[PDB]
Design an enzyme around this catalytic site. Sequence first.
Site, short mmCIF file in Angstrom:
data_model
loop_
_atom_site.label_atom_id
_atom_site.label_comp_id
_atom_site.label_asym_id
_atom_site.label_seq_id
_atom_site.Cartn_x
_atom_site.Cartn_y
_atom_site.Cartn_z
N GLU A 28 39.74 -0.92 11.16
CA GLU A 28 39.17 -0.58 12.45
C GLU A 28 39.41 0.89 12.80
O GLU A 28 40.42 1.48 12.41
CB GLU A 28 39.66 -1.51 13.58
CG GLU A 28 41.17 -1.59 13.78
CD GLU A 28 41.58 -2.50 14.93
OE1 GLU A 28 41.39 -3.73 14.81
OE2 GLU A 28 42.11 -1.98 15.94
N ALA A 30 37.71 4.11 15.94
CA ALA A 30 37.24 4.32 17.32
C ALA A 30 35.77 3.90 17.51
O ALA A 30 35.37 3.58 18.63
CB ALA A 30 37.42 5.78 17.71
N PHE A 31 34.98 3.91 16.42
CA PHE A 31 33.55 3.57 16.43
C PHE A 31 33.24 2.10 16.09
O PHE A 31 32.07 1.69 16.16
CB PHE A 31 32.77 4.55 15.51
CG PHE A 31 32.81 5.98 16.01
CD1 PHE A 31 33.92 6.78 15.79
CD2 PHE A 31 31.74 6.51 16.72
CE1 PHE A 31 33.96 8.10 16.27
CE2 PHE A 31 31.77 7.83 17.19
CZ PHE A 31 32.89 8.61 16.96
N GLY A 32 34.28 1.33 15.75
CA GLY A 32 34.13 -0.09 15.41
C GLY A 32 35.07 -0.60 14.33
O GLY A 32 36.04 0.07 13.96
N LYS A 33 34.80 -1.82 13.84
CA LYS A 33 35.63 -2.45 12.81
C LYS A 33 34.85 -2.81 11.54
O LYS A 33 33.62 -2.91 11.55
CB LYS A 33 36.40 -3.65 13.38
CG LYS A 33 35.65 -4.49 14.42
CD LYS A 33 36.60 -5.43 15.16
CE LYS A 33 37.18 -4.82 16.41
NZ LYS A 33 38.41 -5.53 16.84
N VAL A 34 35.58 -2.98 10.44
CA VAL A 34 35.04 -3.29 9.13
C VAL A 34 35.59 -4.63 8.69
O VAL A 34 36.78 -4.90 8.86
CB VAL A 34 35.29 -2.16 8.08
CG1 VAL A 34 34.73 -2.52 6.71
CG2 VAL A 34 34.66 -0.85 8.57
N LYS A 54 30.17 -3.09 8.46
CA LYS A 54 30.64 -2.20 9.50
C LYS A 54 29.95 -2.66 10.80
O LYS A 54 28.73 -2.63 10.89
CB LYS A 54 30.28 -0.74 9.15
CG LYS A 54 30.78 0.30 10.14
CD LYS A 54 30.23 1.67 9.76
CE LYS A 54 30.15 2.63 10.93
NZ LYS A 54 31.48 3.16 11.31
N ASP A 154 33.22 16.58 5.01
CA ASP A 154 34.52 15.92 5.07
C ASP A 154 34.88 15.30 3.71
O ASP A 154 35.44 14.20 3.63
CB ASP A 154 34.66 14.89 6.21
CG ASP A 154 36.10 14.49 6.55
OD1 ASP A 154 37.05 15.19 6.09
OD2 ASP A 154 36.29 13.50 7.28
N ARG A 158 40.26 10.34 0.64
CA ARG A 158 40.20 9.25 1.64
C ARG A 158 38.75 8.80 1.90
O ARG A 158 38.53 7.66 2.33
CB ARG A 158 40.85 9.68 2.96
CG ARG A 158 40.12 10.87 3.65
CD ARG A 158 40.83 11.33 4.93
NE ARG A 158 40.18 12.57 5.41
CZ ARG A 158 40.48 13.79 4.96
NH1 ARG A 158 41.42 13.95 4.04
NH2 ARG A 158 39.83 14.85 5.41
N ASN A 159 37.78 9.68 1.63
CA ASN A 159 36.35 9.45 1.85
C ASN A 159 35.59 9.11 0.58
O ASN A 159 34.38 9.27 0.50
CB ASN A 159 35.73 10.62 2.63
CG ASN A 159 36.12 10.60 4.07
OD1 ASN A 159 36.39 9.54 4.65
ND2 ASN A 159 36.21 11.76 4.70
N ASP A 172 32.40 6.21 3.01
CA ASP A 172 33.45 5.76 3.91
C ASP A 172 32.82 4.98 5.05
O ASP A 172 31.63 5.07 5.26
CB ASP A 172 34.23 6.96 4.46
CG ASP A 172 33.39 7.86 5.34
OD1 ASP A 172 32.68 8.74 4.79
OD2 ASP A 172 33.42 7.68 6.58
C1 LIG Z 1 31.62 8.53 13.47
C2 LIG Z 1 31.50 8.56 11.97
N1 LIG Z 1 32.21 9.54 11.28
C3 LIG Z 1 32.03 9.59 9.93
C4 LIG Z 1 31.17 8.68 9.23
N2 LIG Z 1 30.99 8.73 7.84
C5 LIG Z 1 29.77 9.00 7.22
O1 LIG Z 1 28.71 9.24 7.85
N3 LIG Z 1 29.82 8.97 5.82
C6 LIG Z 1 28.57 8.92 5.09
C7 LIG Z 1 28.21 10.21 4.39
C8 LIG Z 1 28.18 11.51 4.92
C9 LIG Z 1 27.69 12.56 4.08
C10 LIG Z 1 27.27 12.28 2.76
C11 LIG Z 1 27.32 10.95 2.22
C12 LIG Z 1 27.80 9.92 3.05
C13 LIG Z 1 27.94 8.46 2.82
C14 LIG Z 1 27.65 7.66 1.71
C15 LIG Z 1 27.95 6.28 1.79
C16 LIG Z 1 28.54 5.72 2.95
C17 LIG Z 1 28.83 6.53 4.09
C18 LIG Z 1 28.51 7.88 4.01
C19 LIG Z 1 30.50 7.67 10.03
C20 LIG Z 1 29.69 6.56 9.45
C21 LIG Z 1 28.49 6.14 10.13
C22 LIG Z 1 27.73 5.08 9.60
C23 LIG Z 1 28.15 4.44 8.40
C24 LIG Z 1 29.33 4.84 7.72
C25 LIG Z 1 30.10 5.90 8.24
N4 LIG Z 1 30.65 7.62 11.40
#
Ligand SMILES: Cc1ncc(NC(=O)NC2c3ccccc3-c3ccccc32)c(-c2ccccc2)n1
Length: 300
Positions: A28, A30-34, A54, A154, A158-159, A172
């Site tokens: 979990e 601030a934007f929700g839980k997994v 998510k 980012d 961790r990502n 992530d």
């Molecule tokens: C508030 C917030 N802060 C960071 C977040 N992280 C991302 O947007 N990560 C992206 C990403 C960003 C650049 C490039 C690739 C990829 C990627 C690929 C696969 C899966 C996820 C990601 C999210 C978020 C929003 C919806 C779904 C998952 C995460 N929400």
Amino acid sequence: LQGHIIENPQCVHHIKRRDIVLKWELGEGAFGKVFLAECHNLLPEQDKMLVAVKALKESARQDFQREAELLTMLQHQHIVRFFGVCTEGRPLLMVFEYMRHGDLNRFLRSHGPDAKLGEDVAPGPLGLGQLLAVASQVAAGMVYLAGLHFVHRDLATRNCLVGQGLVVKIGDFGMSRDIYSTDYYRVGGRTMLPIRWMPPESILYRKFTTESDVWSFGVVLWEIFTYGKQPWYQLSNTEAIDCITQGRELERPRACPPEVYAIMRGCWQREPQQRHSIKDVHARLQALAQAPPVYLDVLG
Ligand SMILES: Cc1ncc(NC(=O)NC2c3ccccc3-c3ccccc32)c(-c2ccccc2)n1
């Protein structure tokens, strides 16, 4: 928000709520839980499969739609698979593949010299070949994003996520600022910057490009070869900003051969335009990852 996919100015698959069966929470933020869930009729010759879901905690509905559009575009062997959304009723859900080993930082730490304690990995610390395979896969995902003109902002272990068979992918669930809060520098009330992974132009001028992501990839490469240690761990946030802007470079990790440390320094050229391209970085790491035991035994 650095790392939020919607900061990229570039159709969505839907899944019925009845086809998603929640098992338990994985995390979990601030934007929700997994949650871990079973998803029915998603992929043929499977019938039932595990997925990570998510759940969204308005403008958030618009952010959700934009995120889903961008996530649908990303389709690569080293990008976490996005299956689609569930828009019937509340909470809105985003469905992704399940990655058994969790995030890459946790995986590195648990397979490093500081670990407490065998299906996909041998006993003891990850060998050179395994560390090179991890690095190569992250680089491959960064090559794909550079090709689509996406700027991550980012990138860090961790990502990234690790699945069965040590498959490593970038992705992530937007909880890194909550789970790894010490990896961010808090400015104002809500701004959290991953300064330790940022180049001087991003810290000093707030400029983010494919080149600032190359620099971050160099820091990822360093995290891989230190088994997930935090870059500049000996420094406070203000002290790290000082070292990065003054031009100081991360030391060669003990498990890192000079050939690999060369690739890291290539990502850390002060001048963005003189940093090696991600295509060149991936080509070098892949070559070292698939090198025969005779060749990398003389590297180690
Ligand atoms: C508030 C917030 N802060 C960071 C977040 N992280 C991302 O947007 N990560 C992206 C990403 C960003 C650049 C490039 C690739 C990829 C990627 C690929 C696969 C899966 C996820 C990601 C999210 C978020 C929003 C919806 C779904 C998952 C995460 N929400």
